[PDB]
Amino acid sequence: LSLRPYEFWFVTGSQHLGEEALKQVEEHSRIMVNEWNRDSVFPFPFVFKSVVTTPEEIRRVCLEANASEQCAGVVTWMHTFSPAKMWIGGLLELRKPLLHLHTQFNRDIPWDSIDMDFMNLNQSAHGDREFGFMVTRLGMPRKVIVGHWQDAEVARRVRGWAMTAVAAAVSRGLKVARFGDNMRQVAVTEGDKVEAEARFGWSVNGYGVGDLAERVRAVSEAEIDRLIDEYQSLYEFAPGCEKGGPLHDGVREQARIELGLRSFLEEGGFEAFTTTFEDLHGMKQLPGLAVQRLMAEGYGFGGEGDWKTAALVRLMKVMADGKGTSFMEDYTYHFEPGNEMILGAHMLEVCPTIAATRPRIEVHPLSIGGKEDPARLVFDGGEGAAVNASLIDLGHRFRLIVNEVDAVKPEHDMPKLPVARILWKPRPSLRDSAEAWILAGGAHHTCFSFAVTTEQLQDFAEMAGIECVVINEHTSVSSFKNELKWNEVFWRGR
Amino acid sequence: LSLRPYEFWFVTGSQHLYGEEALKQVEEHSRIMVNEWNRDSVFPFPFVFKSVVTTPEEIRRVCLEANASEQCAGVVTWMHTFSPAKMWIGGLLELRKPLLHLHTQFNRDIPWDSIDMDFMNLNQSAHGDREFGFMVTRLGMPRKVIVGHWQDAEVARRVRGWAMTAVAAAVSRGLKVARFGDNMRQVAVTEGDKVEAEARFGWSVNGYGVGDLAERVRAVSEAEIDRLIDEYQSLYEFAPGCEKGGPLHDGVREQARIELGLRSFLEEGGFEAFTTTFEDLHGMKQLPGLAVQRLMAEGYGFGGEGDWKTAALVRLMKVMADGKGTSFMEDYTYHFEPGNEMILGAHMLEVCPTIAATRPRIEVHPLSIGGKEDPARLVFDGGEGAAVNASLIDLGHRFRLIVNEVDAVKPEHDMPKLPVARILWKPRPSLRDSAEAWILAGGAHHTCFSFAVTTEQLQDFAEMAGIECVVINEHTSVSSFKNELKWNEVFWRGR
Amino acid sequence: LSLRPYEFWFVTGSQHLYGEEALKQVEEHSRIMVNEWNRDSVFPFPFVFKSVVTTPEEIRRVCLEANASEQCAGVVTWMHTFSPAKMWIGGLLELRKPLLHLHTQFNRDIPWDSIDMDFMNLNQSAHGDREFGFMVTRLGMPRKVIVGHWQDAEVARRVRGWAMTAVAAAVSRGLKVARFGDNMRQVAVTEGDKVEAEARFGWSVNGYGVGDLAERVRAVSEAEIDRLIDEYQSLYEFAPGCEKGGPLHDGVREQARIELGLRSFLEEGGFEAFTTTFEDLHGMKQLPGLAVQRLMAEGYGFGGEGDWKTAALVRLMKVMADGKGTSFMEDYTYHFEPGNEMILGAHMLEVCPTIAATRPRIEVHPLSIGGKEDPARLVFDGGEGAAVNASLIDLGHRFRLIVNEVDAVKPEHDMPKLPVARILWKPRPSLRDSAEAWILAGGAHHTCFSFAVTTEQLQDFAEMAGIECVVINEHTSVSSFKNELKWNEVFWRGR
Ligand SMILES: [Mn+2]
Ligand SMILES: [Mn+2]
Ligand SMILES: [Mn+2]
Ligand SMILES: [Mn+2]
């Protein structure tokens, strides 16, 4: 699932206090931007925009940055002193993520060269502080990275942020197609699409399942054959799911459902969607392998109408570069002292991008939805550092909840388990993470990711103006409880 | 649509200072009072007297009982004597039922002749009801306060007004709403938080696939269509081509189908309101039209394009109105004729016949919207008189109830080309100002219009549900209204 | 001082999506769990299985029953399966009983061989509980959350600790406090708002003149004194002068007289806590002393000088402590010996013998304070080990519970000229920092000292009551703590 050619504008501040210094500032910036496009750490193209010098110049490049659908964020560096009142109109206008790069062109103080002319020119030490003030003063969410522009860690911090900014750009235009209403009587998948569209840009809208049913009925048995070809190209088949076997019908249906979905979603420029098993009129099966393959392509998905998680999965997939990110649900607990684990799955819908094992197409009965035995990819999830993120609506506001977890390889086979699954050990413990999660009103539905950092989901939440609360090795429940209370008083009316 | 046999618990507060005999005389007064009110037997909901409360345990048990009692629509509290109000804290903190504080007195007049420390000791409501007043205000509880002698008629009118609001509230707490399809796509004001709504009003709002209604209408007996088309004929004129064997009696048949499949679903689930969306009618011959208007008539809430907020409100307001003169309504177009400025309200089809001046007429007309077969609908002219046009919207953090007082006017000219039931109103204070105030209140295009709900009832409901009620009437000026929106915003946030 | 036969309601949530037999599996899992938890007299409060709740009406019924039940001290909810939480909103909104969300699972371990969707459909708590977790948070209602397998020992300890908090909470709800006299004049911290206290904690705090007490103390017969003296002899050492036919014994007997009058008065009114004031002892021979220590040992709350908050807090903490290691206490003087900094805790007379390490000794000594006759009191050395020192103060707009974690220490040195029961502790983290943190928090000089009540139980009680709980322990930094106070203040305002 293709991105738009997303670029970050490097904006360098000065004022007027000569043209010769202004051109030294300019080449410094261009050099920095040119060597960033050639450092393999920096994930999207940086564009030198201007040395900005005047209010009208600051405001123009900020207006330009809003209108530029390809501008994902703006990186500001005050090379010289840049009297920050000049910046007010621009910053008031800026609505693209902001990195304040607090840097210096030169790394070391030239101890014998150090003169008033050098100092007059390389002023960021204070020029970035005066800008710091102005951005803090207007209450604006921004990223602040301090270091020499060549620094390896600066590089790593800047790209982590850049992935987040790209996730936010996709967020601004993000169209979510829901095929059915929320699973009846369910609270946490409910919330305010208007707030969500105001807060995150998400477009979330209902299509009757009729409208998907209609477009699955319109797929050629020919085009199903092309896709089965490419299923044989990718996936193991369970005895009876390969060509001719008694269950391959089921696989064909999911290939049908898959291609009807891709058609609907590609037509409407949707990057995420939800289904609801409670409403499967005109569908042979609850979508499963179809969804699993669409998530792998880079599509957000949420079960039982869960547009928040659907959107969250697309965004985190954008943050992760497509890798090791799935829709996820906490299905059961392994409480063994010393080996406490959560088994994470869904009815069918786990993205193969988290798979440790080569995915296998299987067909098994699924009571839930009263439809035909769904085909689905079955795998063991990978191992290592991951985040389990839920975005809930508290009514007045959204709260992003991120749990740091360690996914573990199953030691034991689960041969009667018909769904792809992942085992994780939540930090700081099952007992404590689950408790902090529940107190935070974390959903059952999460986006799980091996490739999104805590810092990225925090930066995303900063960009969107929502609370993000993190459960990890350092979380204690008493301290967490208090952080919820204090965040609440900060975040109400914001 | 039957109400539960809702009742109203009279609770009379006293202490022990005065004795057991005073407490019997207090019980007697209270029973005479409840008994007179019930004899005047026209009012649909009885007052059930609940023995005199004198202890925190007594106060607390009745308030727990009242909470459990599905019949209990509200509690009417009266301090006959000083009933020291700290006693009431346990009860008041338990009470989740609409409270009326009836600030009354058994005798009307100071019996100047005989008035002695015995009478002053027994007829203490003057201070008793104030002591209780402080306590209810201190706990930040919403209550109605009706002051006057219990036999006063304005007391009767205010209490009955409130009781109808209390019963509407009670319907609200259990209110189940079926949604056939999602909101009309890209629409804002019909969108909202169903969890906030359930928490705040008790409405259960859950979506059923349109297929779930289509399956139910496919099952509707070609025969039972026939038995209903018989009821149609009995009630409603048929437009030429729509009656008996005419080339559009199918349209009417297909609405009787939908009417019976809708009612099957809604009766099965105990649903007292529903929503349809023209954007999702897979398995339907027509957008429910005649079907929906009939269902509104017998008391169902309805909202179009998945508008559950208005569906619930149409339901609540229909219950407040005693089933009468209450409809789902949309502002469709304006008459801007200076001195004759009016709003024409309709919907594509779904206008309740309970607001009809002219006997409704089954007609079938094309409807582009939805790309389905020519829907049958009842067409009629709305009544006239004082009415309320009420929107309930989701500001994101809380709900706002917006009531515009309007005057529905008998139409001067015919709208013979207009295939939908319709109504004209002049909104107070003016079209210019109401519509401006309405827009600044962010009022929906979807409303419940009612000839029978008072402003005071919708305020009373808002107070009961702890939501802002903004009212646009003859006294509204936009400068003030704006300020009141700003000051209300600061009071209502996180409540 | 007997408790109601309090019980905890285990409520299991499911629905219908897996069938009526999957519901029987759930019901049988929960019955096992409840039976297993009741099995031994492990605990004075049983768990009661409440049939699985699967509908809004079921969930509302059990929460309404829970509230109405005087025996039900708390509800323990567990989502065995997905139990869509909109169903729970109506229920949760009614529940004014301590909620513990037990996030558990019937099986400890994933049965790796057999785990199939029959199993993943039934043991879904991993998500069931989170969906419920969201609803409870969303309603912002206070709850304990305990994760862990139901047979896990840590789970049992926590559930037992919370259970004791909830019973204390239940006692708080009907807690009746008698004040014999008003606040000590000009004292601030013992002052507060009895109305806010009733609303937030459930305490009925009311003033008797001491005449009421003296009167009842006078009506005590010389024979009831004689029988209680005989009980004193069996329990306590009499100091030389204090035994029958000693010159001081009359002082003891007058304490015996006060103990009997007080007990009569307190039992008559169902009072479980009381206050005296040395400033108002008209009709009394002595400041109540031995009598008060005795009444505290029986489980009564006491606060001196009209301190009803502490009195109530002492009753609550005694219930939490299961009547053990819990007294009214005051900070009397400081040992500032560097390396050996400790607080000497006492009161004029009123220290509960339940914190006694040594056999309490009836002593008669002069007491200037109140200008009455040489009161008899139990004198003893407080126990040693981990303890909490709790002040509940009124900040004006809300209560604040302050808990200092201390280490009671055996006195190295005799204090043979100190006529009062006393205890030493080392306040955590240091005398320097605890006293500073305590002063910044406005901690009272009057505390409930307890060997048995844990920081988490009081924190749990605070959660329950919706008041700030501030804890000073080994982890406390005075800089961090002043910020926690500012931030707490902002949250707790208007709540
Ligand atoms: Mn799910
Ligand atoms: Mn909301
Ligand atoms: Mn409409
Ligand atoms: Mn004292």
Side-chain angles (χ1 to χ4, degrees), chain B residues 68-364:
Chain B
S69 170
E70 267 142 330
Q71 290 70 230
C72 191
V75 173
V76 172
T77 52
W78 168 50
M79 310 312 107
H80 192 314
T81 71
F82 208 58
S83 200
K86 286 161 74 184
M87 292 195 314
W88 280 86
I89 299 177
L92 284 175
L93 282 180
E94 293 298 342
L95 197 52
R96 290 218 94 235
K97 284 312 171 75
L99 168 66
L100 159 58
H101 179 200
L102 183 82
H103 178 28
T104 200
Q105 200 177 253
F106 179 74
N107 59 303
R108 205 192 77 184
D109 291 351
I110 304 189
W112 315 91
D113 271 346
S114 67
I115 178 159
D116 64 353
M117 205 48 47
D118 279 326
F119 177 82
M120 297 277 268
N121 282 2
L122 189 61
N123 297 111
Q124 295 198 310
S125 314
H127 51 102
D129 279 313
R130 280 163 206 256
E131 159 69 334
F132 182 75
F134 165 76
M135 199 62 256
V136 185
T137 303
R138 170 72 194 252
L139 299 175
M141 295 181 52
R143 69 191 165 314
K144 185 121 212 168
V145 185
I146 294 156
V147 179
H149 190 257
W150 64 277
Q151 262 173 341
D152 179 296
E154 195 198 63
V155 168
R157 202 174 318 115
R158 294 183 70 203
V159 169
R160 278 181 295 113
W162 178 77
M164 293 308 303
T165 307
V167 167
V171 168
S172 194
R173 254 195 323 291
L175 175 54
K176 306 218 150 273
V177 182
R179 293 214 312 159
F180 306 106
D182 216 7
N183 291 79
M184 179 170 171
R185 295 183 279 277
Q186 291 289 11
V187 183
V189 63
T190 59
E191 204 48 275
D193 194 331
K194 289 178 195 76
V195 167
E196 197 56 24
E198 190 136 18
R200 197 66 69 163
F201 311 119
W203 314 338
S204 181
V205 179
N206 296 295
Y208 296 84
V210 294
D212 265 40
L213 180 55
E215 195 177 333
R216 194 53 63 93
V217 295
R218 294 194 221 288
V220 171
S221 1
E222 215 75 14
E224 220 176 325
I225 302 184
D226 299 342
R227 285 95 189 230
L228 186 68
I229 296 295
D230 284 8
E231 206 191 18
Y232 289 6
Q233 250 177 317
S234 181
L235 290 166
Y236 306 127
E237 202 187 320
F238 282 61
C242 288
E243 81 293 312
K244 272 242 278 188
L248 300 182
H249 186 80
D250 198 288
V252 182
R253 281 192 63 70
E254 197 48 64
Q255 275 291 315
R257 202 170 211 235
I258 294 175
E259 169 177 340
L260 283 153
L262 270 169
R263 192 198 307 262
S264 172
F265 211 90
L266 306 165
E267 279 186 311
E268 198 172 327
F271 297 106
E272 295 191 338
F274 66 99
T275 68
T276 74
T277 163
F278 65 77
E279 292 191 338
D280 184 26
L281 285 170
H282 284 266
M284 317 292 296
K285 256 44 181 159
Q286 307 166 192
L287 176 73
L290 167 50
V292 173
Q293 299 173 274
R294 287 258 313 147
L295 291 161
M296 296 200 63
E298 62 185 78
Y300 284 95
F302 172 80
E305 295 86 50
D307 187 359
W308 52 270
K309 275 183 262 67
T310 313
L313 171 59
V314 166
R315 171 64 193 161
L316 301 177
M317 285 182 71
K318 265 172 184 296
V319 158
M320 271 171 215
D322 193 8
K324 310 197 245 204
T326 306
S327 187
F328 187 54
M329 188 55 63
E330 192 167 20
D331 321 51
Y332 243 116
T333 214
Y334 298 147
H335 202 58
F336 270 130
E337 183 176 28
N340 186 48
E341 289 100 335
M342 35 203 194
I343 306 186
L344 176 148
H347 209 263
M348 312 156 57
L349 310 164
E350 307 96 302
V351 188
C352 177
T354 65
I355 75 166
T358 77
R359 177 166 26 77
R361 181 189 343 283
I362 299 194
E363 311 186 0
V364 177

Side-chain angles (χ1 to χ4, degrees), chain C residues 184 187 190 278 302-305 307 328-332 346-348 350 445-446:
Chain C
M184 178 179 171
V187 177
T190 61
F278 63 75
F302 173 76
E305 301 124 49
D307 187 351
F328 184 61
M329 187 56 55
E330 190 176 20
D331 315 68
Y332 244 98
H347 211 259
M348 314 182 263
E350 312 95 316
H445 56 307
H446 284 168

Side-chain angles (χ1 to χ4, degrees), chain C residues 29 46 52 89 102 124 136 181 216 230 240 243 302 306 314 325-326 412:
Chain C
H29 281 180
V52 181
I89 296 173
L102 178 61
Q124 301 193 328
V136 182
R216 195 159 291 234
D230 287 32
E243 63 288 312
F302 173 76
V314 168
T326 299
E412 328 190 316

Side-chain angles (χ1 to χ4, degrees), chain C residues 108-122:
Chain C
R108 204 193 72 194
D109 286 350
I110 301 171
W112 311 106
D113 295 322
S114 71
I115 185 147
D116 69 3
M117 285 241 31
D118 284 330
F119 179 92
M120 296 267 280
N121 291 337
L122 188 93

Side-chain angles (χ1 to χ4, degrees), chain C residues 339-386:
Chain C
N340 181 33
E341 301 91 333
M342 41 191 29
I343 301 196
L344 183 43
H347 211 259
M348 314 182 263
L349 303 171
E350 312 95 316
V351 183
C352 175
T354 54
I355 73 167
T358 80
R359 174 69 72 73
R361 206 168 103 116
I362 300 186
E363 304 197 353
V364 178
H365 298 274
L367 179 66
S368 45
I369 304 162
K372 291 292 142 153
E373 207 282 314
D374 300 351
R377 88 298 303 278
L378 298 174
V379 182
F380 47 92
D381 286 330
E384 83 192 297

